[PDB]
Amino acid sequence: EWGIELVSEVSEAMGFVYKEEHPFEKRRSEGEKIRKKYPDRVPVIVEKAPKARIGDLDKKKYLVPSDLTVGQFYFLIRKRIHLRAEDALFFFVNNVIPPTSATMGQLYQEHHEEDFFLYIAYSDESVYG
């Protein structure tokens, strides 16, 4: 069908403040608890890519409906950081841009870390930096 695919090397260069600030076992305990308490949501850490010149998100554990699509989540985040619909926004999970049609639950199952969080970096540019 000759659709566009934004490819990239899988990599883990992004330092998430949530990870820097909490030891793995604390994160894992919390992630496990959250998954049990809110079984129709997935826990997501969302942080701006280092060189991105756009607004920052509040430091929260974002509990996202599992059936929300990635495309919908883009709009949710645009609203939080006061980006227009016409403004570029890209998500990276281990340096790779996820498909907009995936649900957040699918994305979570594919990519959550061993602490039971999903980690998403965001940028205004399509290549992480």
Curated annotation (Swiss-Prot):
The precursor molecule is cleaved by ATG4 (ATG4A, ATG4B, ATG4C or ATG4D) to expose the glycine at the C-terminus and form the cytosolic form, GABARAP-I. The processed form is then activated by APG7L/ATG7, transferred to ATG3 and conjugated to phosphatidylethanolamine (PE) phospholipid to form the membrane-bound form, GABARAP-II. During non-canonical autophagy, the processed form is conjugated to phosphatidylserine (PS) phospholipid. ATG4 proteins also mediate the delipidation of PE-conjugated forms. GO terms for molecular function: beta-tubulin binding; GABA receptor binding; microtubule binding; phosphatidylethanolamine binding; ubiquitin protein ligase binding. The keyword Kinase does not apply. One of its GO terms (cellular component) is autophagosome. Changing residue 129 to A: Impairs localization at the autophagosomal membrane. The record marks 30, 41 as: Interaction with LIR (LC3 nteracting Region) motif of ATG3. Residues 49-129 are annotated as: Interaction with GPHN. GO terms for biological process: autophagosome assembly; autophagosome maturation; cellular response to nitrogen starvation; chemical synaptic transmission; extrinsic apoptotic signaling pathway via death domain receptors; microtubule cytoskeleton organization; mitophagy; positive regulation of proteasomal ubiquitin-dependent protein catabolic process. A lipid is attached at residue 129 (Phosphatidylethanolamine amidated glycine). Residues 16-35 are annotated as: Interaction with beta-tubulin. Its main location: membrane. It is found in: Cytoplasmic vesicle, Autophagosome membrane; Endomembrane system; Cytoplasm, Cytoskeleton; Golgi apparatus membrane. Residues 61-63 are annotated as: Interaction with LIR (LC3 nteracting Region) motif of ATG3. Residues 49-81 are annotated as: Interaction with GABRG2. A lipid is attached at residue 129 (Phosphatidylserine amidated glycine). The keyword Protein transport applies. Heart, brain, placenta, liver, skeletal muscle, kidney and pancreas. Keywords: Apoptosis, Autophagy, Cytoplasm, Cytoplasmic vesicle, Cytoskeleton, Golgi apparatus, Lipoprotein, Membrane, Microtubule, Protein transport, Transport. Interacts with GPHN and NSF. Interacts with ATG7, ATG13. Interacts with ATG3. Interacts with alpha- and beta-tubulin. Interacts with GABRG2. Interacts with RB1CC1. Interacts with ULK1. Interacts with CALR. Interacts with DDX47. Interacts with TP53INP1 and TP53INP2. Interacts with TBC1D5 and TBC1D25. Directly interacts with SQSTM1. Interacts with MAPK15. Interacts with TECPR2. Interacts with PCM1. Interacts with TRIM5 and TRIM21. Interacts with MEFV. Interacts with KIF21B. Interacts with WDFY3; this interaction is required for WDFY3 recruitment to MAP1LC3B-positive p62/SQSTM1 bodies. Ubiquitin-like modifier that plays a role in intracellular transport of GABA(A) receptors and its interaction with the cytoskeleton. Involved in autophagy: while LC3s are involved in elongation of the phagophore membrane, the GABARAP/GATE-16 subfamily is essential for a later stage in autophagosome maturation. Through its interaction with the reticulophagy receptor TEX264, participates in the remodeling of subdomains of the endoplasmic reticulum into autophagosomes upon nutrient stress, which then fuse with lysosomes for endoplasmic reticulum turnover. PANTHER family: MICROTUBULE-ASSOCIATED PROTEINS 1A/1B LIGHT CHAIN 3-RELATED (PTHR10969). Belongs to the ATG8 family. This is Gamma-aminobutyric acid receptor-associated protein. It comes from Homo sapiens. The lineage of its organism: Eukaryota, Metazoa, Chordata, Craniata, Vertebrata.
